[PDB]
Paper text:
Atg18 belongs to the protein family of β-propellers that bind polyphosphoinositides (PROPPIN). The corresponding primary structure contains a series of conserved WD40 repeats forming the 6 or 7 blades of a β-propeller fold. The autophagic membrane adapter Atg18 reveals an unexpected structural plasticity in multiple modes of oligomeric organization.
Interestingly, once dialyzed into the low-salt buffer (100 mM KCl), Atg18 formed large supramolecular structures when imaged in negatively stained EM samples. Using cryo-EM of vitrified Atg18, we identified helical tubes of 260 Å diameter including a diamond-shape repeat pattern along the helix. 2D class averages of the helical tubes revealed individual Atg18 propeller disc-shaped structures including individual blade separation. The assemblies exhibited a pitch of ~100 Å with 5.1 helical units per turn. D Fourier shell correlation threshold at 0.143 indicates resolutions of 3.8 and 3.3 Å for the 3D structures of Atg18-WT and Atg18-PR72AA, respectively. Interestingly, the lipid binding sites appear buried in the T-interface of the helical tube suggesting a stabilizing role of the involved residues. In line with the highest affinity, we found that PI3,5P2 binding leads to disassembly of the helical tubes.
Numbering used by the authors:
A (entry chain C): 5 to 64, 75 to 155, 222 to 321, 409 to 445, 458 to 500
B (entry chain A): 5 to 64, 75 to 156, 222 to 321, 409 to 445, 458 to 499
C (entry chain D): 5 to 64, 75 to 155, 223 to 320, 409 to 447, 459 to 499
């Protein structure tokens, strides 16, 4: 089993990107299958658009169309790339002290921001062109958790958010580009700010003792927020409005030193006759897909009313098949 | 009489720097005199610190100590320099699209800012190290055209973004202590001053009757008054002790209308009313105002802080003679 | 996640020395971070001085400087190296039946002690050069005899009858004034004055058979920390019954070896931790526990109440 270095959903949560030490793979979610693969070499960053056969590959920057098996262009940078995010309008490249913004269509350089160092390569980017926003942390050279709200459409900053007292650990933007959620390096407080005005809307407490946070992600309908940390547990905070609404516990066999990213899908019908949820024949269950760095996928279901600990239905392997 | 290309006061308003097409000159204000001069060549930027025998010289960037007649350093830039400002802590050089910040002591480069093009070379520098702030305009790259970026020089991180005006910014000025910032649109009809730490607009002034260009803005030492000069050959004084201009400075009629005019406001001094029939106690405090124009003349005025109104002119010298 | 083979603090308790089957890493405690790492190979003992970019490497003996990336010297021994400890004056290598003493500056050999076998590789060093001592057990070839060896003049000073049974763990305070030992049954702690040899303190611990692994003093010697196999760490005050206790979370791997070290009191912010531990700042003595499974745990104790201590954080070494 080759070592994997990168896992990410697409901007809609219906696909899986992945990168190994020997190549990269592309899966699907509902009719699970391996759409694409390539045994080139070590890949560190594999980012995909809303399907559409467009990929960004960073070896351990090249953009490739997988349907045509051709290369659009290759871009070199003085320093190593730390993060890459896309929407159907702009292409963003982050280095440890520089942010590069490209037009996804014409691929010409548009802007460059000289920022204070970001060793963690943190970003959050709105995927919708109607509200194309970019946010990145602004540490000083107590004013540690300042985040710069940058508008990609006009290429100008909009406001400065005094998010947290300590360094920012993770940040995400809803699908429509309306909200933003950030967490400090202690991972004890989750705060949600409205990117339009900047006022803090929601503040959530995560866990008891300070533990690291890996990734934050909204639902497609912005109903729930998902956080994943070193506790081998995934919390879900309900944004329909403190304490997490419902929590996800991986099986005890899973190694505790695994990176976990998750995503929440649209509610769908499941059969209660087959599954003793403990009864109407069918009720709508919110699906959550959790993939771990060891190479497994987990499917949970969440009751929007009951919440609580979520049942697990199935489990796959992303390596091999 | 050689043509002059650049005039400005020092950060305290008690000295004069000037640049001709044949050299530069340095004057003094109260015991008027010519401290220094060199007929080297064309000079476009001659900026001085708080006396201290330190100068920035740009040919038609070199740092020269006038007392020692030596060269501290010499630095080149890819494009022409548009503005240079200093405090006793930082040195700022602005090109049309780039801002360079240098430490005044070590002279090593500290930061670089990539901004949207500023053909007008507009900035504002706080001269006090306690509140060292730099503000530069951020127009959209091709209504929100008058966006200005509040940048902190101490920590080298921006603090907030101020939506100053609807149209492009034409002039900026920061008080001596770095507390307030004043901005002027390209129409020169509305003068707005913002409190830099909070960001709220404190005062709003109407200037003149019809729209006309504004040359420069400058605060008093005690932030009591604000001086603006425009193409109407009239200088207005706005009282910040708290609309309409408090007092107006009318130059003599024989003066050419196409003259760049910069001004400064000094601390109140005792003047003898026996010599000057102000229209009476022997002495009364009157604020002295020095207005040097691009034709090469200095004009001394006095304002009565209670009466205000049209100001009397005491004397006129002639720079370059 | 490669397996680790050595985990230990520095002489001040403000760093983490850790060596894996693939390399070694050097961490920090309050501003947690990865100071250094090399993927060279299997390392059995990685010991560090008071920062100062000095390391000792034992393969699964070489002294390296991490700042200059150079090798000072390499020395071989007839048997496997069991333990290495350092201070600002002396370097000591312990083997199965021999103890080697080196000058940390010159690297010249100074003295060699012929001791009865030590299968556990037990020794303790005073880290201060003012009272540079070395203590090691002396089993008969009268079981818990500890030889107080003066590294300053290279001569033993006195012999203490510590315990009737085998000695399990020994430690010397930072100032080199006190010595603490624990028997093989791990129920009684004895603290001796290294100058005179009088028994000063006696502590009770381990109601059932839980072996004692490590003993450590605080910087001010106010507290004594003992870690055993029971997944619970006791704190004794040197001002009988234990003063405070540490309970690791149950989810942790039980097949682990845990050490600990107590630091100087610091201030913690209440606003950072909304759920647990909720005066914006309080003085709480920090306790750092690292286990072989690869996790660093931080606990805090109230200097007056004591009791069971909260856990502020749990960071992940090797990542």
């Amino acid at each position: 089993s080759p070592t994997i270095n990168f896992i990410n959903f697409n901007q809609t949560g219906t696909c899986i990107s992945l990168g190994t030490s020997k190549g990269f793979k592309i899966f699907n979610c509902e009719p699970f299958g391996k759409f694409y693969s390539e045994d080139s070499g070590g890949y560190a960053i594999v980012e995909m658009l809303f399907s559409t056969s467009l990929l960004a590959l960073v070896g351990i920057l090249r953009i490739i169309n997988t349907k045509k098996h051709s290369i659009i262009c290759e871009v070199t940078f003085p320093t190593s790339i730390l993060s890459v995010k896309m929407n159907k309008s702009r292409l963003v490249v982050l280095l440890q002290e520089q942010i590069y913004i490209y037009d996804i269509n014409t691929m010409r350089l548009l802007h460059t921001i000289e920022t204070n160092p970001n060793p963690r390569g943190l970003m959050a980017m709105s995927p919708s062109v109607a509200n194309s926003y970019l946010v990145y942390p602004s540490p000083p050279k107590i004013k540690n958790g300042d985040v710069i709200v940058f508008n990609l459409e006009t290429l100008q900053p909009t406001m400065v958010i005094e998010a947290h007292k300590g360094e920012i650990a993770a940040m995400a933007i809803s699908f429509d580009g309306t909200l933003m959620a950030t967490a400090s390096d202690k991972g004890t407080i989750i705060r949600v700010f409205d990117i339009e005005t900047g006022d803090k809307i929601y503040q959530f407490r995560r866990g008891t003792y300070a533990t690291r946070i890996y990734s934050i992600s909204f639902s497609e309908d912005s109903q729930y927020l998902a956080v994943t940390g070193s506790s081998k547990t995934v919390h879900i905070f309900k944004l329909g409005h403190s304490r997490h609404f419902a929590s996800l516990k991986l099986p005890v066999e899973t190694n505790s030193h695994v990176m976990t990213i998750s995503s929440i899908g649209s509610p769908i019908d499941i059969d209660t006759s087959e599954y003793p949820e403990l009864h109407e024949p069918v009720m709508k269950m919110v699906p959550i897909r959790v993939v771990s760095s060891d190479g497994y996928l987990y499917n949970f279901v969440m009751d929007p009313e009951r919440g609580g600990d979520c049942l697990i239905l199935s489990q796959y392997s992303i390596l091999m098949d």
